[PDB]
Write a protein that binds this DNA or RNA. Structure first.
Ligand SMILES: [Mn+2]
Ligand SMILES: [Mn+2]
Ligand SMILES: [Mn+2]
Ligand SMILES: [Mn+2]
Ligand code: NA
Length: 327
DNA sequence: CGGCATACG
DNA sequence: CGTAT
DNA sequence: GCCG
């Protein structure tokens, strides 16, 4: 009843087991802070299974047979059902290690390995990081300088205003080029931590050199606070606000139209959905999937897709619209 | 036992 | 390493 | 942590 891959089942944005999935995702996050990507994946998968169930779980017996639910994840659910709280989860929640790792890794430019080094060096606050600016890359400095704004949820009004200015810069840089909203907002989310845009042109090859031209034109309009030939740009915008402005993270990607369905699929997510889809592709169908194409390593050929639907079908998967990819 | 998605900057 | 989904 |  429950397939093992997240790409084989609908996962809507609103589901019926937020309490259980949120607890399992704390353990997944903590597993990553300690350097166990395997444990992180399992806990993420178990949480995602609960998001795909049609009703709330109220008895431990409702977990029998579900993939990715073993002794550990079942004990967590069990404790939550009986006592409303899981000791392990609360221990992690309150721990200085978890709180400081979450604080540091939330910084744009800081990952687990960087945050772990700083923690081992005794650092605990953002001010501690500001004290010693020599130990900061230019990317981390931008992330730290705009951390407050970047912690404010991005709203749909922000998306619409951002798309207008991106579309204007793109149109000035290359007539006929298009801008597609991707990421969580394409999956139907009402908030987010950034905005993701995918850019192409209907005539293969015309998009060459586009992203630098777009960035220059945004910078000349005073819209760029930070950015780094390139096809992916992880920026921070200076988004006008009534009488003021706020910093917003914006990802711009350029793809040739031949790759557009694969880039759209990859950049629409969710993150777990794409990992599971790529694992399914390779492990179950012997095909290599990424945001550029779908590769057959035996024939040494690429699958010519015209749409996301074509990709799902070539993989033998029932099509899922973006709003059902919230694994 | 060993894998666990797969790229670009 | 960081980033992205 | 779970599973092929
Ligand atoms: Mn008990
Ligand atoms: Mn996003
Ligand atoms: Mn993004
Ligand atoms: Mn993301
Ligand atoms: Na980070």
């Amino acid at each position: 009843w429950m397939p093992a891959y997240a790409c084989q089942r609908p996962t809507p944005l609103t589901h019926h087991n937020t309490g259980l999935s949120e607890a399992l995702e704390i353990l997944a996050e903590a597993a990553g802070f300690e350097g166990s990507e395997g444990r992180l994946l399992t806990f993420c998968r178990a949480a995602s299974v609960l998001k795909a169930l049609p009703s709330p779980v109220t008895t431990l017996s409702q977990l029998q047979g579900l993939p990715h639910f073993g002794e550990h994840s079942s004990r967590v659910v069990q404790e939550l059902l009986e006592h409303g709280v899981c000791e392990e989860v609360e221990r992690v929640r309150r721990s200085e290690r978890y709180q400081t790792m979450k604080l540091f890794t939330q910084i744009f430019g800081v990952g687990v390995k960087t945050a772990d080094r700083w923690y081992r060096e005794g650092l605990r606050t953002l001010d501690d990081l500001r004290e010693q600016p020599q130990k900061l890359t230019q990317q981390q400095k931008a992330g730290l300088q705009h951390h407050q704004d970047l912690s404010t949820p991005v709203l749909r009004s922000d998306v619409d205003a951002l798309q207008q200015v991106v579309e204007e810069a793109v149109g000035q840089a290359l007539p006929g080029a298009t801008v597609t909203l991707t990421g969580g907002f394409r999956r139907g989310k009402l908030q987010g931590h950034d905005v993701d845009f995918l850019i192409t042109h209907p005539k293969e090859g015309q998009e060459a050199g586009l992203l630098p031209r777009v960035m220059c034109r945004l910078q000349d309009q005073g819209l760029i606070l930070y950015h780094q030939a390139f096809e992916r740009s992880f920026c921070i915008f200076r988004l006008p606000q009534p009488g003021s402005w706020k910093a917003v993270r914006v990802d711009l990607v350029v793809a040739p139209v031949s790759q557009f369905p694969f880039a759209l699929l990859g950049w629409t997510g969710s993150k777990l959905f794409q990992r599971e889809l790529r694992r399914f592709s390779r492990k179950e169908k012997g095909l290599w999937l990424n945001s550029h194409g779908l590769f057959d390593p035996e024939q040494k050929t690429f699958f010519q897709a015209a749409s996301e639907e074509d990709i799902f079908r070539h993989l033998g998967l029932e099509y899922l619209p973006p709003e059902q990819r919230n694994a």
